[PDB]
Swiss-Prot record:
This is Neogenin. Residues 21-118 form the Fibronectin type-III domain. Belongs to the immunoglobulin superfamily. DCC family. Multi-functional cell surface receptor regulating cell adhesion in many diverse developmental processes, including neural tube and mammary gland formation, myogenesis and angiogenesis. Receptor for members of the BMP, netrin, and repulsive guidance molecule (RGM) families. Netrin-Neogenin interactions result in a chemoattractive axon guidance response and cell-cell adhesion, the interaction between NEO1/Neogenin and RGMa and RGMb induces a chemorepulsive response. The chain holds residues 944 to 1054 of 1461 of the full protein. It comes from Homo sapiens. Knockdown of NEO1 in C2C12 cells results in the enhancement of the BMP-2-induced processes of osteoblastic differentiation and phosphorylation of Smad1, Smad5, and Smad8. Conversely, overexpression suppresses these processes. The Fibronectin repeats 5 and 6 mediate interaction with RGM family molecules. Widely expressed and also in cancer cell lines. Interacts with MYO10. Interacts with RGMA and RGMB. Interacts with BMP2, BMP4, BMP6, and BMP7. It is found in: Cell membrane.
Amino acid sequence: GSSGSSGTAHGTTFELVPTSPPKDVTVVSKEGKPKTIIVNWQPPSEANGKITGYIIYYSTDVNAEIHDWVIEPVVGNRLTHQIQELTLDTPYYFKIQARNSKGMGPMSEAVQFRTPKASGPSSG
């Protein structure tokens, strides 16, 4: 594997951010609430190191610069996130990433998910 001696096995001497995109990227819609949607995902196999949290990006535009893209930081190292108060009949692009004690990594391909539609005056 590599060349080097061993002695002070007091953990790692250095960490390497997750330079790999997440897996199990799915985007569903809330039951009853069209303006609300749930985004699930899973940690990458590489996982050069450990995990502490995740970040999701979403914006009406797709060609827009990450700068414009909003940052939805997830707490409790959660693998799922919910976004309410959104627009209907509009193509929204979502992105999921993995960040650890060190930092964040590369974002996955833009997930195009067409928002649902309100069917019936009843909801709840």
